[PDB]
């Protein structure tokens, strides 16, 4: 888990730092990928019409 050695996060987590000094782990909301690189949809789906998710 690449996220410094000052904190500890389980599974794929994002490194959210405070006002410089301490590093924390932010709750990962399942960051998947879709067709466009400006959105994200559940694994197996895609971003259509830039709003909903399709198959």
Token code pair at residue 28: 């990962």
Q: Do 44 and 55 touch, CB atoms closer than 8 A? A: yes
Burial of 46 (0-12, 13-18, 19+ CB in 10 A): middle
What b-and-e string marks burial along 10-42, b requiring 16 or more CB atoms within 10 Å of the CB?
A: eeebeeeeeeeeeeebeeeeeeeebeeeeebbe
Experimentally, the structure was elucidated by: NMR
Asked if 10 and 1 touch (Cβ cutoff 8 Å), the reply is: yes
1-55 in CATH: which number? 2.10.25.160
């Amino acid at each position: 888990v690449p996220c410094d050695n000052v904190s500890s996060c389980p599974s794929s987590d994002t490194c959210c730092q405070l006002t410089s000094g301490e590093w924390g782990c932010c709750p990962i909301p399942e960051a998947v990928c879709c067709s466009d690189h400006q959105h994200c949809c559940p694994q197996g789906y895609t971003c259509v019409a830039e709003g909903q998710c399709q198959k």
